[PDB]
Amino acid sequence: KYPRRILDVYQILQSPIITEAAIKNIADENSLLFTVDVRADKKMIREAISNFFGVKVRKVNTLIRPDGTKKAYIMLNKEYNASELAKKIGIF
Amino acid sequence: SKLQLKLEQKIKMKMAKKIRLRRNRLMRKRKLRKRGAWPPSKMKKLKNV
Amino acid sequence: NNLISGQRRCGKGRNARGIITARHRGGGHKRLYRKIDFRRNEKDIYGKIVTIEYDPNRNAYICLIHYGDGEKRYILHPRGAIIGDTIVSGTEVPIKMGNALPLTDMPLGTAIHNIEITLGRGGQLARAAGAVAKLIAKEGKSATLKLPSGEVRLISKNCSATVGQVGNVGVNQKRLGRAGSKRWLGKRPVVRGVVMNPVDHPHGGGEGRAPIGRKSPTTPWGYPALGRRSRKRNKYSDNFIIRRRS
Amino acid sequence: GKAALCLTKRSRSRKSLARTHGFRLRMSTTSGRALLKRRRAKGRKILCTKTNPSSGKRASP
RNA sequence: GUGAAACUAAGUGGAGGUCCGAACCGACUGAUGUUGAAGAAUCAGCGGAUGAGUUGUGGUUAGGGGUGAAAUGCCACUCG
RNA sequence: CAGGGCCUAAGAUCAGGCCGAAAGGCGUAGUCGAUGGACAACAGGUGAAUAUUCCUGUACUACCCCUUGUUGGUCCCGAGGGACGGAGGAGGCUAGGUUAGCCGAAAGAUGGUUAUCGGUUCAAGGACGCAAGGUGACCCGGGUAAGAAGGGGUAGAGAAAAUGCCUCGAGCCAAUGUUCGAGUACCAGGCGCUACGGCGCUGAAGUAACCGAUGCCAUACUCCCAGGAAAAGCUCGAACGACCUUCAACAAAAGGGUACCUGUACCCGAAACCGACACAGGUAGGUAGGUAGAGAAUACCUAGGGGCGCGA
RNA sequence: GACCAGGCCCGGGCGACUGUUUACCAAAAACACAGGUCUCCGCAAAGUCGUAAGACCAUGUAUGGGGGCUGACGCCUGCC
RNA sequence: UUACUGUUCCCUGGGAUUGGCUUAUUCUAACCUUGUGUCAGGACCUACGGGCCAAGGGACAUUCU
Numbered sequence: 008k009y010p011r012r013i014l015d016v017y018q019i020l021q022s023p024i025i026t027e028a029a030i031k032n033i034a035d036e037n038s039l040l041f042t043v044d045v046r047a048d049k050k051m052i053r054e055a056i057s058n059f060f061g062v063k064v065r066k067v068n069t070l071i072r073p074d075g076t077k078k079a080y081i082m083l084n085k086e087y088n089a090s091e092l093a094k095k096i097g098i099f
Numbered sequence: 100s101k102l103q104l105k106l107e108q109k110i111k112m113k114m115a116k117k118i119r120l121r122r123n124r125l126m127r128k129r130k131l132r133k134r135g136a137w138p139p140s141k142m143k144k145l146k147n148v
Numbered sequence: 149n150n151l152i153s154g155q156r157r158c159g160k161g162r163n164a165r166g167i168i169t170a171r172h173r174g175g176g177h178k179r180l181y182r183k184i185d186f187r188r189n190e191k192d193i194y195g196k197i198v199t200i201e202y203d204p205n206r207n208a209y210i211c212l213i214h215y216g217d218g219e220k221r222y223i224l225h226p227r228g229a230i231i232g233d234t235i236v237s238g239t240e241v242p243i244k245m246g247n248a249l250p251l252t253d254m255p256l257g258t259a260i261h262n263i264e265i266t267l268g269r270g271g272q273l274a275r276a277a278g279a280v281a282k283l284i285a286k287e288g289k290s291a292t293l294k295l296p297s298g299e300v301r302l303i304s305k306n307c308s309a310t311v312g313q314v315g316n317v318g319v320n321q322k323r324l325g326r327a328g329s330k331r332w333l334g335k336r337p338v339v340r341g342v343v344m345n346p347v348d349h350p351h352g353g354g355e356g357r358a359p360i361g362r363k364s365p366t367t368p369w370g371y372p373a374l375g376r377r378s379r380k381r382n383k384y385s386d387n388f389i390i391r392r393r394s
Numbered sequence: 395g396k397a398a399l400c401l402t403k404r405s406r407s408r409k410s411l412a413r414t415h416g417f418r419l420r421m422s423t424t425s426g427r428a429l430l431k432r433r434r435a436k437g438r439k440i441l442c443t444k445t446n447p448s449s450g451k452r453a454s455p
Numbered sequence: 456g457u458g459a460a461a462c463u464a465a466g467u468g469g470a471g472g473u474c475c476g477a478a479c480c481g482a483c484u485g486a487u488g489u490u491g492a493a494g495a496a497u498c499a500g501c502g503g504a505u506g507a508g509u510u511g512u513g514g515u516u517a518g519g520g521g522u523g524a525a526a527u528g529c530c531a532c533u534c535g
Numbered sequence: 536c537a538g539g540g541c542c543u544a545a546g547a548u549c550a551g552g553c554c555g556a557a558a559g560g561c562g563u564a565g566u567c568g569a570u571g572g573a574c575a576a577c578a579g580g581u582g583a584a585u586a587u588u589c590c591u592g593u594a595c596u597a598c599c600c601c602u603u604g605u606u607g608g609u610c611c612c613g614a615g616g617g618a619c620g621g622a623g624g625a626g627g628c629u630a631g632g633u634u635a636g637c638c639g640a641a642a643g644a645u646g647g648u649u650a651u652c653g654g655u656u657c658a659a660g661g662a663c664g665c666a667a668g669g670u671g672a673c674c675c676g677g678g679u680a681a682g683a684a685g686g687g688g689u690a691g692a693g694a695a696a697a698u699g700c701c702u703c704g705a706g707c708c709a710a711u712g713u714u715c716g717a718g719u720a721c722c723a724g725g726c727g728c729u730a731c732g733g734c735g736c737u738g739a740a741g742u743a744a745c746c747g748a749u750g751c752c753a754u755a756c757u758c759c760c761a762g763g764a765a766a767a768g769c770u771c772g773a774a775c776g777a778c779c780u781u782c783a784a785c786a787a788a789a790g791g792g793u794a795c796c797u798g799u800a801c802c803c804g805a806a807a808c809c810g811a812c813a814c815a816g817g818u819a820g821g822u823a824g825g826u827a828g829a830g831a832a833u834a835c836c837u838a839g840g841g842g843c844g845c846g847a
Numbered sequence: 848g849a850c851c852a853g854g855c856c857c858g859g860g861c862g863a864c865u866g867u868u869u870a871c872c873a874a875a876a877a878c879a880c881a882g883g884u885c886u887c888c889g890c891a892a893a894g895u896c897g898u899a900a901g902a903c904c905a906u907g908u909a910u911g912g913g914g915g916c917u918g919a920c921g922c923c924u925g926c927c
Numbered sequence: 928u929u930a931c932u933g934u935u936c937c938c939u940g941g942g943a944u945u946g947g948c949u950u951a952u953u954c955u956a957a958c959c960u961u962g963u964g965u966c967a968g969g970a971c972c973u974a975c976g977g978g979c980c981a982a983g984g985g986a987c988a989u990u991c992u
C-alpha cells in the first residue's frame with residue numbers, strides 16, 4: 008500500500024522537452040518526453056499520466072543525466088495518440 | 100499391474116531429464132556470459148580475428 | 149560425510165591482534181576439518197568399521213563407524229585393525245583393541261591410547277601415530293601409567309581410554325625428498341639467528357661465519373636455549389608426577 | 395614488464411578507499427572525530443577527499 | 456625362473472621442485488642514454504617457465520613497531 | 536545485461552558479557568561484507584551522438600485474475616541436496632577453416648588464357664530422440680540368478696533421513712543432431728534517380744566432402760599425495776512451540792493481464808587511467824583468420840586500424 | 848639456401864642440487880633446502896603477544912610442538 | 928659487554944585473601960579448574976555465558992603488598 012518515497016505528486020512532472028529529436032519521436036513511437044524529479048519512479052509517473060490526461064501508459068523508461076536531472080520516456084498505448092495530446096498542450 | 104510402474108517411471112524420468120538439461124543449458128549461458136563471449140551477434144563479427 | 153566441514157581458524161600463526169606468535173606457519177594446501185569423537189559416549193552399542201580415511205589434521209588415520217541407530221562417528225585408527233571389526237565403549241566391555249572403558253576395569257600391562265585427564269573433556273593424551281601408554285599399576289584413588297615420552301604420570305581411575313596402539317607406525321621411515329614437500333604442509337623456511345643482525349637476534353653480528361660469542365646460546369628473546377627447564381614451579385599437577393621423562 | 399618505482403597510485407577502486415579513508419571510517423574512532431574537528435576549524439570545503447556514495451554516477455560498481 | 460620367492464625380458468602407463476622453448480614472471484653481460492624519450496629505461500643476447508609458480512579482486516599485521524628462504528633489506532620515489 | 540531488493544567466506548563490527556586511568560580492548564549469537572553461490576532473451580532492423588535497453592518477430596521468469604479440486608495452512612524445527620583438488624591422455628561432437636559443386640558477373644589494351652572475381656548466410660527457445668561414443672552383473676557367440684540408472688516396502692529411540700533387511704527394474708548418461716523458429720527475411724548482381732547521399736524496384740543459388748580445436752559432453756575416466764570453502768535458494772517430512780484461517784489458505788493445466796532502484800555516453804595493449812608532459816614506460820580479463828610452420832614463435836597478408844604533431 | 852634456430856672439449860676451487868636476496872652500482876662461495884644432532888614441553892603444556900581479561904600454538908597431544916647449531920649423499924666426527 | 932646506575936620477565940620469604948581436627952600429614956567450607964550434565968523466558972544458548980547439581984584439586988596456588 009505504501010509508495011517507495013513520499014513527496015509532492017504534482018512535482019513529479021516539471022515540464023516537457025522541446026527538441027527536433029523529441030518531436031520526431033512522437034510520430035514514430037507514440038511517445039512523450041518529460042523531465043522528472045530525481046526521487047521519482049516509473050510507478051508514480053505511470054499513475055500520474057493516468058490522472059492528468061486520462062490516458063493509458065504502455066511503458067515508461069527513465070535515465071539520470073550527468074547534471075543530476077532525471078528524464079522520462081513515456082510510451083502511450085496505440086489506442087491513444089501522443090500527437091493529439093501534444094496539440095492539447097500547445098507543443099507540436 | 101507392472102505396466103503402471105514402468106509407464107509412470109519413464110514419465111518421471113522424462114520430466115527430470117527435461118528440467119535437468121534445461122538447467123545445464125542456462126548455466127552454460129551464465130558461464131560464458133561472465134566470460135564475456137556469449138552473444139553470437141558479437142562472436143560472428145569476431146570469428147576471424 | 150556430514151562430519152567434515154570447512155569452518156576452521158584461518159590465518160594460522162596470527163592472533164587476534166594479527167601479529168605472528170607461532171612463527172613459520174603459512175602457505176600449505178587447504179584442508180577440511182574432521183569431527184573425531186574422543187569422549188566415546190553413546191555406550192553399550194556395537195559399531196563396525198567400513199573405511200580407513202586420511203586425516204590431514206594429524207599424523208594418524210581415522211576409521212568411520214556405523215551404529216545400529218544410524219549414527220556415524222570418526223575415531224582414530226588402531227594398529228592391527230581391519231574392515232569389519234567391532235568396537236564398544238562401556239564398563240564390562242571385553243579387553244581387546246578398539247574398545248573404550250575406564251581404567252578401573254583394565255588389567256595391568258595394557259596397551260592404551262586416547263587417554264583423558266578429566267571426565268567430560270575427552271581423550272587428550274596418546275593421539276599421535278604409533279602412540280601407546282602402558283598401565284603400570286593402580287592404587288586406590290588414582291592409577292599410574294607410562295606415556296610415550298617415558299614419563300610416569302598419575303591419572304585418576306575413572307578416566308576413559310582406548311585399547312591398542314595407533315595406526316600407521318611406519319611414517320617416520322619416509323624422508324621428505326625435497327623442500328617443496330615441506331611447504332605443502334605449511335611450514336616456512338627456518339632462518340638461523342647467527343646469520344641475522346644484532347638487532348634481530350643475539351647471535352647476529354660478526355664478519356664471516358660468526359661463532360656464538362656468548363656465555364650460552366640464547367633464544368631470540370634473550371633466554372637460554374639449552375638446559376633451562378621451562379616447567380612452572382609449584383604447578384597444580386606437581387603431585388601427580390612420579391618421575392621425569394628420559 | 396616491471397612498473398617503475400614511483401607508481402604508488404595504481405588506480406584502486408573507490409569502494410575500497412572509502413572503506414579506508416571514508417566519512418564512516420572517521421566517525422568510528424575518536425581520532426577521526428577529532429580529525430574532522432581540525433578540518434572544520436580550518437574551513438576546508440571537502441572534509442574527506444576519499445569518499446563516494448553507494449549509488450549514482452560515482453558508484454564504483 | 457623357483458618348491459614358493461628373490462631375480463629377470465617385453466608391452467602398457469605418463470611420473471618429475473625433469474629437458475628445449477613463447478606468453479607471463481625475472482634482470483646475468485655489453486652497448487646506448489647519463490641538463491636522457493624514461494628520476495633505472497631502450498636495443499641485442501640471457502635465467503625460470505606444472506611450480507617453493509605467476510596474477511587479479513577484496514582484506515590483515517603500524518614505528519621502544521611490523522615484516523623479512525635475513526640484505527639492516529622493505530614498510531606510498533623517504534628507513535641503523 | 537551488471538549490482539542492490541537473496542546467501543555467505545576472508546575480514547571488519549557486536550546486543551548482552553569479561554577486562555581496563557581515560558579513549559578503549561577481548562568476545563557470543565546476530566548483522567554487514569564479491570573477487571564466489573543463487574536467479575528469467577535472442578536474431579534482425581532503425582541511426583548526427585544510445586540500444587540484448589527503442590521498433591519488428593519469436594521466447595523466458597515472477598506475481599495476480601479466472602476455472603475445478605483439496606480442504607488446514609504459514610514460520611520455527613529435523614534431514615537430504617547444494618558441495619567443489621591437481622596431473623594426464625584417449626574418445627565422441629561442434630565452432631572455425633580449406634576445397635569441390637551450384638549461381639551470377641567478368642576481357643582487367645601484352646605471348647597465351649577464364650585456369651579469373653563474388654555469393655553460397657541465419658540465433659535464443661520450443662518439441663522429439665540418440666551410437667558404431669561412455670557406463671551397466673553374468674563366457675569364449677549364446678545361455679543365466681542375483682545385479683546399474685532410477686523406484687518401492689519394512690524393523691528398531693524411529694515422519695523424512697540414516698543404518699540393517701527384503702523387493703521391482705536392461706537399460707541409463709549428454710555435447711551434438713532432427714524438426715519448427717525461418718521469411719523469396721538476409722544476399723551477390725541487375726534495372727532507374729539524383730543534391731551522389733543513398734533511395735526505389737528486382738534479387739538467382741543458399742549443397743557436399745576433407746582437416747579440426749587450447750572450446751562442449753566433463754567435478755567422464757585413470758593415477759597420485761599435499762587430500763582438495765561456507766550459507767541460502769531448491770526438495771522431503773513428524774512431534775513440541777508460535778501466527779492465521781472455509782478460503783480469506785495450499786496445490787495442478789490452459790488462457791489472459793501486469794512488470795521496482797542504480798549503472799548504460801566516450802577513451803581503455805591509451806594523447807582521456809597510472810607515470811608532474813599529447814612521456815619510446817606500466818595496466819586484470821575476453822574474442823583468436825589465411826600461406827609456410829610442431830606452434831598463440833617467426834616472415835608476408837585478410838578483416839579492421841594506422842603512416843608515429845616540425846620540415847626541406 | 849630467407850626470418851626463426853645449441854658452440855664444444857679437458858682440468859681444478861666453493862656450494863650438494865630446483866629455488867631466495869641488498870626495488871635504484873653487489874644474484875655470489877651469502878641465504879634457504881631435504882636430512883642430522885642437542886635441549887625444552889604431559890596439555891590449564893612449553894614458547895610468543897598483551898596493563899589485564901584472553902589470543903595464537905591447537906579445535907593439535909611427545910612418530911607432536913617450540914628453540915639453538917650443522918646443512919644432500921658417502922667415510923668419520925678425536926683429547927681437556 | 929664481566930662499563931656505571933636502573934627497569935622488566937622469573938625464583939624465594941613475611942603479611943592479606945585464609946579455615947577445621949590430629950602428630951608435618953589429613954579434612955572441606957573460601958578459592959582454582961571442568962562438564963556434549965541439567966533447568967531457564969516468545970524462542971535458542973551442542974553459541975560464549977547465567978542458575979542448579981556433580982567431578983578433580985585445595986587452604987597450596989593464582990592475585991595484591
Ligand SMILES: [Mg+2]
Nearest residue numbers: 068069070071
Ligand atoms: Mg535504467
Ligand SMILES: [Mg+2]
Nearest residue numbers: 147148823824
Ligand atoms: Mg588472428
Ligand SMILES: [Mg+2]
Nearest residue numbers: 343344345526
Ligand atoms: Mg648478513
Ligand SMILES: [Mg+2]
Nearest residue numbers: 346347349350
Ligand atoms: Mg642484542
Ligand SMILES: [Mg+2]
Nearest residue numbers: 351352353361
Ligand atoms: Mg655474535
Ligand SMILES: [Mg+2]
Nearest residue numbers: 355356357358
Ligand atoms: Mg672469522
Ligand SMILES: [Mg+2]
Nearest residue numbers: 395396479818
Ligand atoms: Mg603484467
Ligand SMILES: [Mg+2]
Nearest residue numbers: 473474504865
Ligand atoms: Mg622444469
Ligand SMILES: [Mg+2]
Nearest residue numbers: 475476503504
Ligand atoms: Mg626453459
Ligand SMILES: [Mg+2]
Nearest residue numbers: 481482868870
Ligand atoms: Mg627481485
Ligand SMILES: [Mg+2]
Nearest residue numbers: 498499500501
Ligand atoms: Mg631484453
Ligand SMILES: [Mg+2]
Nearest residue numbers: 476477501502
Ligand atoms: Mg627467454
Ligand SMILES: [Mg+2]
Nearest residue numbers: 475501502853
Ligand atoms: Mg639455457
Ligand SMILES: [Mg+2]
Nearest residue numbers: 474502503865
Ligand atoms: Mg635449468
Ligand SMILES: [Mg+2]
Nearest residue numbers: 423425517518
Ligand atoms: Mg595506524
Ligand SMILES: [Mg+2]
Nearest residue numbers: 517518519520
Ligand atoms: Mg613516535
